[PDB]
Write a protein that binds this ligand. Structure first.
Ligand SMILES: [Zn+2]
Ligand SMILES: [Zn+2]
Lengths: 225, 225
């Protein structure tokens, strides 16, 4: 919603303790100062429009991996893409976090397209790839990765890391589709009570920089062409 | 002598694989933007793709909000490979979640990050939603269940406190939660024994009015000063 202008809060980056002690911190904050000056002057109305609220058309459900920033790789702007990022782009149906996020995207800010986006070189999948099925689960990671481990064990023999990565996107897509939020949106949309919303599964290919559609899109109706 | 196909033709052909790009101009637009981006990067930076294929070594972990107006890489003028990211509604880091705890630990132990920034933002709908709420009859929709700690926080703040006050305190609460994490504790105790690099936690506030990131100066490291 509506941002109220700010107000001890101190804007001069000369007064940031960390920026005084760490070059890398100063660099990033100075990067931000320069970004803001630049944008303020090439689109004086940008900051003003964004203070009013947000209307992203997309929700990106993606991985924490530093190589996969959604706005850069989709060449978008702030305000285009509502985002969840966690390790190995999971959307667990039991998770309040994820259901709250998905419901808010769709019902409160007006998202139309939901993309689950995996990527090659995904350490979550690479790590799940050589685990045994749980009886119970070593670390927070192995436990968190349980559904991806189970998934690995349902793959045809000779399947590689990229097959796991791909099926993990499709599994997240199914989890999203089976949420109350989307099932509810689709029930309404079918009857013309709500806009149609779509869930997509994509894979970002680190070797090319290209997003590849895995074509597992679903909407309120049979999605064929 | 034979000329390559022009980029726009190659891109149209490349996107033929995507059913949805054939159905939604919005989707085609984002996949075209991506392809133009990837072409450019590959041309200006012939070995970007090569290095990112090999692995990642970000110095930062960003713990931020899903809000579409707050993409970390854009507003800090960074490149892919610089920032490992968690994004959820209103930038929570719940100490009992395996997902957050696994992400944090993976970032420090596996990925090698040195700085963890909790970043809140003005106009935060997560905070604005928890400002209105009475207290846990134990939570009437999963958003309310997810915003409990912020709902709690809200009721502890002095009378006349506004949204921006809650947003700031939410960052500090999150920072407190990360610091109290087993991961941070065990990096800090290990570091004080001169066995691990020092890792630091910061609290930032992104001001949508100006585009500036405010350091709230709540940085913690293994030692004071
Ligand atoms: Zn990943
Ligand atoms: Zn927010």
């Amino acid at each position: 919603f509506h941002a109220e202008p700010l107000k001890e809060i101190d804007m001069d980056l000369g007064h940031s303790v960390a920026a005084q002690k760490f070059k890398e911190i100063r660099e990033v904050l100075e990067g931000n100062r320069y970004w803001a000056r630049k944008v303020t002057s090439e689109e004086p109305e940008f900051m003003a429009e964004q203070v009013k609220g947000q209307a992203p058309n997309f929700l990106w459900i993606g991985c924490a991996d530093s190589r996969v920033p959604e706005v850069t790789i989709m060449a978008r702007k702030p305000g285009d893409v509502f985002v969840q990022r966690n390790v190995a782009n999971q959307f667990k149906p039991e998770d309040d976090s994820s259901q709250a996020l998905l419901n808010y995207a769709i019902m409160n800010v007006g998202v139309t397209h939901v993309m689950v986006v995996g990527h090659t070189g995904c350490g979550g999948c690479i790590a799940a790839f050589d685990q045994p099925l749980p009886t119970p689960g070593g670390t927070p990671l192995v436990r968190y990765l349980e559904p991806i481990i189970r998934l690995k064990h349902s793959l045809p023999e000779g399947s590689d890391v990229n097959d796991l990565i791909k099926e993990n996107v499709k599994m997240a897509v199914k989890n999203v589709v089976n949420s109350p939020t989307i099932q509810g949106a689709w029930e309404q949309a079918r009857k013309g009570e709500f806009r149609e919303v779509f869930v997509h599964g994509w894979l970002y290919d680190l070797s090319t920089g290209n997003i590849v559609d895995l074509n597992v899109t679903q909407g309120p109706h049979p999605f064929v062409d």
